[PDB]
Structure formats: C-alpha cells, structure tokens
Amino acid sequence: GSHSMRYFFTSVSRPGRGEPRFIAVGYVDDTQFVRFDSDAASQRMEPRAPWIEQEGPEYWDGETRKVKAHSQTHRVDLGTLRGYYNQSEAGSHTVQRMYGCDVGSDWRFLRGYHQYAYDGKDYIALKEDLRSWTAADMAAQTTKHKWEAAHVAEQLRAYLEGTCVEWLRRYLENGKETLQRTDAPKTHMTHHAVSDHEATLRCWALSFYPAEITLTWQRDGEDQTQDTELVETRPAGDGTFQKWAAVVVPSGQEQRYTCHVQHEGLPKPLTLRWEP
C-alpha cells in the first residue's frame, strides 16, 4: 500500500514574554519518529520511535542544525507577517508549515506538497505540478514573487522527488516491524437502553493501524446517516487507533441494524450485528 513522510512546524509569538515557541514533528504514515521543542532541556532534535534511535551522531547533529535553521526562518516570518498585515505587537500570532511526499506500493514518487499558514489560514501552497504557487491574498503575493525570484519551487521539487522519498524508503526498511505492519480492527458492539422507546448501538474498532477506517451503519441493507454519531479517529497511545459509530434505534429493532468496518488490514469488510 501507499506510504508518506510528513514534517509539521508550528511557531507562536509571545508578546512581552520573549522568544517565540517553536515545535517541529516528523511522521512516517501515522507514526511520530522525531520532535524538536524550543521550551525543552536538550535544544536538540530528539527520537520518538525505536527504529530512528540507531542513527549515528551525524544524523542528530544534521537534523538539529536544520530544525534550528527552520526555527530561525519562522522567527523572521513572524516579524515580517506582523508588518505585512500591520498588526499590533500586543497580539500572539501563529505560523504553520507542512511538507512531505507520498509513495505508492512500489515505494516510487506519487505526490509532494508544501503548505504554509498564517493565523490558521492558507497563506501560500505549492500546486500539484510542484512548479507554481497559490497565494491566499495580496500579502502572500509579496512572498510568491520573492519565492519565484529565488526559484523556491524548483528547490522543493528536488527535495520532494529526491531526498524525501529516499529517506522514507530507508525509514520503512529500518522500521520494518513497526511501519510495514497492518493491525486489523478488533470489533464489538455495545447496547444502552435509553428509554422505553429507544436504544443506542455502539460499533467499536480498537487497536487498528493505520488510522484510515470507515464505520457505516445500515438498516435492512440501506445506508443509515440519520440518528448516527461518528467520533474522530483517536490515538490509543500504543501506536494504534480507536473509533466508534453509534445509532439510536426503536425498541425491538436492534437486529435490523448492521455495522460495516473497512480497513487496509481486513481481507474482507466486516458486518456486525447486535447479539445479546
């Protein structure tokens, strides 16, 4: 199946309270493997998975110098964007950056992406073709011209088609036991009498990986959106994910309702039915 390596960067200004917060996080698929935090003891890039710990001091020195370079760019960006939008120095602002590459089952290049946000909103994003930019507003147009002058699109295309996929493959090999596993959802259903007229059926998917999952309810084989609740997929904290879907049903009608579970790790889609 498909794979991804993604890096996530957040910078927050602290008016009248000194240097801005900077946090960097690296993921292969749904697994965190690296972190940097400006508020932490080490002032170094730190490992967060077993299979990255085995990299030499050259890797950690390299990643530390680079994440600090990212930190310095975001520190400048906060000052620049305060100016571009003429905002007061009284208010906290946020810069976010996300980039990475997808590979197909053959571990070859599929797409790259580089996205940048100011205060929770698209600022500038690289297009599918990796040669041209979408700017959100007139201030991002200033950035877009600066980035076209410096040929930033060409530079990122080269990282995303080259270094990005080549280190993704390495990480997949070194982390074979973790990253190349699929854990099927363990499933069960629960039942809560709610009145003399209704009951909740809750369909559970536990201990699954990766995160991507579909839980659907049917009533007599017909897709049922009405009277359903679907919670966001949530970390269990052990590298696995959890989700549930519930439906409120008339008293006595429980057996009319089926829960359908689709996951990469299920050879076949599961059908569950309430069994008392």
Binding site: K66, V67, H70, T73, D77, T80, K146, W147, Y159
Partner: peptide, 10 residues
C-alpha cells in the same frame, strides 16, 4: 530527514 533546500523566509 528535514530539507535543507527550498526553506526560504516570507
């Protein structure tokens, strides 16, 4: 592995 490419300021 972070890029050392294509990381320009705003």
């Amino acid at each position: 592995n972070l890029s050392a490419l294509g990381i320009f300021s705003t």
